[PDB]
C-alpha cells in the first residue's frame, strides 16, 4: 500500500460515474483528435517513447497487468471496467507518472495538445453528464497533487 | 552482441529496400485494417497487454530507446529511418519476442488476423515494389528462425 493507492480510491469516488458514462466502444477513439498531422504526431509519440524508456520497468509491468485484469471485468453496454479495476488502473498509472521527471510528463501533454483540435474536449464532454465530467476532473487535480509528492 | 543482432543485419539487407518504399506518413495506418470491430479489437489488445507484462523489462526498455534513436534519423520523403536504426529496431524487437513464450506471440498474431480484412495485405503490397516486399518477407522468415532458437 501507498499514498497514490489511497489517492486513487478518492479519485474513483470522484470519477467513476463519468467513466460509466463514456461509451468506450465508440469507434471515434481510433480517429486523430482533429486533423491528422503525421509529423507533429510523431513528435508527440517520440515524447511518450522517451518517457516509457525512462519509467520504472516494474511499474510499467504492473500497469499492464492492471489493464489486463480491468479488461476481464468490463460489463454493461458502454464497456466500462469494474470500479475496483478503475481504481487499480489509476493508481498503477499514477505510480508510472511519479517514476519519471515532471518535464517528460509535460512534454507528452504539450506535444499532444499541439495536435488536439480545440473542439475535441467539449465534444467529448457533450456525450456524458457535464457535472460528472467536472467532478472527475476536480478528482484528477487532487490526485495529481499526491502523485507529484511521490515524484 | 548476439545472434539476433547478427540475424537483424541479414534481415536489413533483405528488407530495407522495402522499408524505404513504404510511405510511413500515410494517414491510413491510423485506420482499422478493414471494419472497426471494437470488441474483437479489444481481445487482440488484451493479448498484446499480456505479452508486454510477460516480456523482459530491460528488453522492452531497450526497444523503446531504439525507436527514439530511429525517430532521430528519419529522412526523405517517406519518413524512413536510417538503415542502421532499422537493424537496431529489428534486433531489439526480436529480443522482446524471444523473451516470452511462443503461445503469447501466436495469440497476438491470431487475434489481429481476426480483425484484418483479407484485402489489406495485397493493398499494402500494391503501394511498394512487390519483389522487394517478397524479399523482405523471406528475410523475416529467416530472422524468426534465429529468434525462435533464442526463445
Ligand atoms: C495508433 C497510434 C497511437 C494513437 C494515439 C496516440 C495519440 C493520442 C492522441 C489522442 C488523444 C487526445 C484526445 C484526448 C482529449 C482529452 C483531454 C482533455 O479534454 O482536456 C481538457 C482540458 C481542458 O482544459 C483545462 O480546463 C481547466 C478548467 O478548470 C476549471 O474548471 C474545472 C471543472 O470544469 C475545475 O473546477 C477547475 O478547478 C477550474 O480550474 C483549466 O482551465 C485548465 O487550465 C485547462 O488545461 O484541455 C487540455 O488539457 C488541453 C490539452 C488537451 C489535449 C491534451 C492531451 C491531454 C492528455 C495528454 C496525454 C496522453 C494522451 C495520449 C496518450 C495515449 C495513452 C497511452
Ligand atoms: C490506437 C489503438 C491501437 C491501434 C493498433 C493496434 C492493432 C493494430 C492492427 C493493425 C495492423 C494490422 C495490419 C498489418 C498488415 C500486415 C500483415 C501482413 O500483411 O501479412 C501478410 C500475410 C500473408 O500471408 C502469408 O503468405 C505467405 C506466402 O509465402 C509464400 O510466398 C512468400 C513471398 O511471397 C515466400 O516466398 C514464402 O516462402 C512462401 O511461403 C504464406 O502463405 C503464409 O502462410 C501467410 O501467413 O498475412 C498474414 O500473416 C495473415 C494475418 C495478417 C494480419 C496478421 C497481423 C500480422 C502482424 C500481427 C502482429 C502485430 C500487429 C499490431 C501490433 C502493433 C504493434 C505494437
Ligand atoms: C502499459 C501502459 C498502459 C496505459 C498507459 C497510459 C498512460 C500512462 C496514460 C494513458 C492514458 C489514456 N489511456 Mg491508457 N494505457 C494502457 C491501456 C489502455 C487501454 C486498453 C484497451 O487497455 C485503453 C482503451 C486506454 C485508454 C486511454 C485513454 C482514456 C487515455 C488517453 C486519451 C485521453 O487522455 O483521454 C482522457 C482520459 C481519460 C478519459 C481517462 C481518465 C482521466 C481522469 C482520471 C478522469 C477524467 C478527467 C477529465 C474529465 C478528462 C481528462 C482531462 C485531463 C487533461 C487529464 N489505455 C496500457 C496497458 N494510458 C492517458 C490519460 O488518461 O491522459 C489523461 C495517460 O496519461
Ligand atoms: C516499446 C515497443 C515498440 C514497438 C514494438 C512492436 C512490436 C513488438 C511489434 C511492432 C510491430 C509494428 N510496429 Mg512497432 N513498436 C514501437 C514503435 C513503433 C512506431 C513509432 C512511431 O515509434 C511505429 C510507426 C511502429 C510501427 C509498427 C508497425 C510497422 C508494425 C505493426 C503493423 C504491422 O504488422 O505492419 C507490418 C510490419 C512491418 C511493415 C514491419 C517490418 C516487418 C518485417 C521485418 C519486414 C516486412 C515483411 C512483410 C513484407 C510484411 C509483414 C508481414 C508479417 C506477417 C510479419 N512501431 C515501440 C517503441 N512494434 C509489429 C510487427 O511488425 O508485426 C509484423 C510487432 O510485432
Ligand atoms: C499495439 C499496442 O500496444 O496498442 C496499445 C497501445 C496503448 C498505447 C497501450 C493503448 C492505448 C491508449 C490509446 C491509444 C488511447 C487513445 C485515445 C484516443 C482518443 C481519441 C479521441 C478523443 C479522438 C477524437 C476525435 C474527435 C473528432 C471530433 C470532431 O470530428 C467530429 C466528430 C465533428 C467535427 O465537426 C468536429 C470535431 C469535434 C473536431 C473527438 O472529439 O475525439 C492501447 C489502447 O492499449 C493499444
Ligand atoms: C518500455 C516500454 O514498453 O515503453 C512503452 C510504455 C507505454 C506506457 C506503453 C508507452 C506509453 C505511453 C506514455 C508514456 C503515455 C504518457 C502520458 C502522459 C500524460 C500526461 C498528462 C495527462 C499530463 C498533464 C499535465 C497537465 C497540466 C495541467 C495544468 O498545467 C495546466 C494546463 C494549467 C495549470 O493552471 C494547472 C494544471 C492542472 C497543473 C494535465 O492536465 O495533464 C509507450 C510509448 O508505448 C512506450
Ligand atoms: C474498448 C474498451 O472496453 O476499453 C476498456 C479498456 C479498459 C482498460 C478495461 C478500461 C479502462 C480504464 C481506463 C482506460 C483508464 C484510464 C486511466 C487514465 C489515467 C491517467 C492518469 C492517472 C494520468 C495522469 C497524468 C498525471 C500528470 C500529473 C502531473 O502533470 C501534472 C498534471 C502537473 C505537474 O505539475 C505534475 C505532474 C505530477 C507530472 C497524473 O497524475 O495522472 C475501460 C474504461 O473499461 C474501457
Ligand atoms: C484497430 C482497432 O480497432 O483498435 C481498437 C482498439 C480499442 C482498444 C478496442 C479501441 C478503443 C478505445 C479507446 C482508445 C478509448 C479512448 C477513450 C478516450 C476518451 C476520452 C474522453 C471521454 C475525453 C474527455 C475530455 C473531456 C473534457 C472535459 C472538460 O474539458 C472540458 C470540455 C471543459 C471543463 O469543464 C474541464 C473538463 C471537464 C476537463 C471529457 O468530458 O471527456 C478502438 C477505438 O475501438 C480501436
Ligand atoms: C500512446 C502510445 O504509446 O502510442 C504508441 C503505441 C505503440 C503500440 C508503441 C505504437 C505503435 C505501433 C502501431 C500502433 C502500429 C499500427 C499499425 C497499423 C497499420 C494499419 C494498417 C495497415 C491499416 C490499413 C487500413 C487499410 C484499409 C484498406 C482499404 O480501405 C481501402 C483503402 C479501400 C477499401 O475499398 C479496401 C481496403 C483495402 C480494405 C489498409 O490497407 O491498411 C506507436 C506508433 O509507437 C504509438
Ligand atoms: C509493460 C509495458 O509497457 O507493456 C507494453 C509493451 C508494448 C511493447 C509497448 C505493448 C505491445 C505490443 C506487443 C506485445 C505487440 C506484439 C506483437 C506480436 C507480433 C507477432 C507476430 C508478427 C507473429 C507472427 C506469427 C507468424 C506465423 C507465421 C506462420 O505460421 C504461419 C501463418 C504459417 C506457417 O506455414 C509458417 C509461419 C511463417 C511460421 C507471423 O508471420 O507473424 C503494449 C501492449 O502496449 C504493452
Ligand atoms: C511516421 C514515421 O516516420 O514513423 C517512422 C517510425 C520509425 C520507428 C522511426 C520507423 C521505423 C521502424 C519500424 C516501424 C520498424 C518495425 C519493425 C517491426 C519488427 C517486427 C518484428 C521483428 C516482429 C517479429 C515477430 C516475430 C515472431 C516470431 C515467431 O512467431 C513466428 C513468426 C513463428 C513461431 O513459430 C516462432 C516465433 C519466434 C514466436 C519475430 O521473430 O519478429 C520508420 C520506418 O522510420 C517510420
Ligand atoms: C493520433 C495520430 O495522428 O497518430 C499518428 C502516429 C504516427 C506514429 C505518426 C502514425 C503512424 C505510422 C504508423 C502507425 C505506421 C504503420 C505502418 C505499417 C505498414 C504495414 C505494411 C507496409 C504492411 C504490408 C503487408 C504486406 C504484405 C505483403 C505480402 O502478404 C502479401 C500481399 C502476399 C505475399 O507476397 C507475402 C507478402 C509479401 C508477405 C506489404 O507488402 O506491406 C499515424 C498513422 O500518422 C498516426
Ligand atoms: Cl491502505
Ligand atoms: Cl504533418
Ligand atoms: Cl558481432
Ligand atoms: Cl465489435
Ligand atoms: K477485477
Ligand atoms: K542513428
Ligand atoms: Na522499481
Ligand atoms: Na533481463
From Swiss-Prot, chains A, B:
Q: Where are the sequence repeats?
A: 2-151
- One GO cellular component from the entry? light-harvesting complex
Q: Does the keyword Nucleotide-binding apply?
A: no
Q: Classify the main location.
A: plastid
Localization recorded for this chain is: Plastid, Chloroplast
Q: Which residues cross the membrane?
A: none
For the site labelled Chlorophyll a binding, the residues are 67
Main role?
Answer: Water-soluble antenna for capture of solar energy in the blue-green range. Peridinin is an asymmetric carotenoid.
Domain-related comment: The mature protein is composed of 2 almost identical repeat units.
Q: How does it assemble?
A: Homotrimer.
Official protein name in the record:
Peridinin-chlorophyll a-binding protein 1, chloroplastic
- Lineage summary: Eukaryota, Sar, Alveolata, Dinophyceae, Amphidiniales
Amino acid at each position: 500500500a501507498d499514498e497514490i493507492g489511497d489517492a486513487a480510491k478518492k479519485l474513483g469516488d470522484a470519477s467513476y460515474a463519468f467513466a460509466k458514462e463514456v461509451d468506450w466502444n465508440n469507434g471515434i477513439f481510433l480517429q486523430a483528435p482533429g486533423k491528422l498531422q503525421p509529423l507533429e504526431a510523431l513528435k508527440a509519440i517520440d515524447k511518450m517513447i522517451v518517457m516509457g524508456a525512462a519509467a520504472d520497468p516494474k511499474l510499467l509491468k504492473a500497469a499492464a497487468e492492471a489493464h489486463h485484469k480491468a479488461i476481464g471485468s468490463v460489463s454493461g453496454p458502454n464497456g466500462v471496467t469494474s470500479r475496483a479495476d478503475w481504481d487499480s488502473v489509476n493508481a498503477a498509472l499514477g505510480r508510472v507518472i511519479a517514476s519519471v521527471p515532471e518535464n517528460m510528463v509535460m512534454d507528452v501533454y504539450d506535444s499532444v495538445s499541439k495536435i488536439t483540435d480545440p473542439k475535441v474536449p467539449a465534444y467529448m464532454k457533450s456525450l456524458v453528464n457535464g457535472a460528472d465530467a467536472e467532478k472527475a476532473y476536480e478528482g484528477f487535480l487532487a490526485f495529481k497533487d499526491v502523485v507529484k509528492k511521490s515524484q
